[PDB]
Design a protein around this ligand. Sequence first.
Ligand SMILES: CC(C)(O)[C@H]1[C@H]2CC[C@H]2CN1c1ncnc2[nH]ccc12
Length: 167
Amino acid sequence: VNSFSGYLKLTDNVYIKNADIVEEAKKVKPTVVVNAANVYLKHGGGVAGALNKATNNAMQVESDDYIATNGPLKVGGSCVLSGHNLAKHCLHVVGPNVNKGEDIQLLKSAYENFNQHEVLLAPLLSAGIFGADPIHSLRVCVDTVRTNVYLAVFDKNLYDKLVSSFL
Ligand SMILES: CC(C)(O)[C@H]1[C@H]2CC[C@H]2CN1c1ncnc2[nH]ccc12
């Protein structure tokens, strides 16, 4: 039993809710919140900007030190950093950016990072400004993640649609 309230059960291990990931994190304080990161951990907009803004830019400050030490992440890769006021940890995961021409097949590699954590609050990867189709992102998620994932989809029209076409 966990505290994730009001989630629809899609599969044995995937759950979904129409909610702002920032609000889910503030409410649940999960062990892991996933950020839809880029390779530079520049948290400008979308999920990352919203998460970072909610930390009062502390996520960005921490991230800049990470990059200075380690260099950019790989597309498909991840790193674990602090969750600040939102969660214990933030798993920064880089999905491929379709607008940059990055290989959508790297989306599966990106989701594999979730399997290192028993429970996660997460967005759909490669959606939004990353260019990919969220219905496809949900499919890859279901077919790749085996741990317990709670998807927060901050778009009621999209939330309702994802359910209606899910195979
Ligand atoms: C709708 C969505 C697919 O879930 C994505 C992407 C479309 C643009 C990105 C932001 N967004 C979010 N998702 C969940 N919590 C969020 N909080 C702030 C933004 C946000």
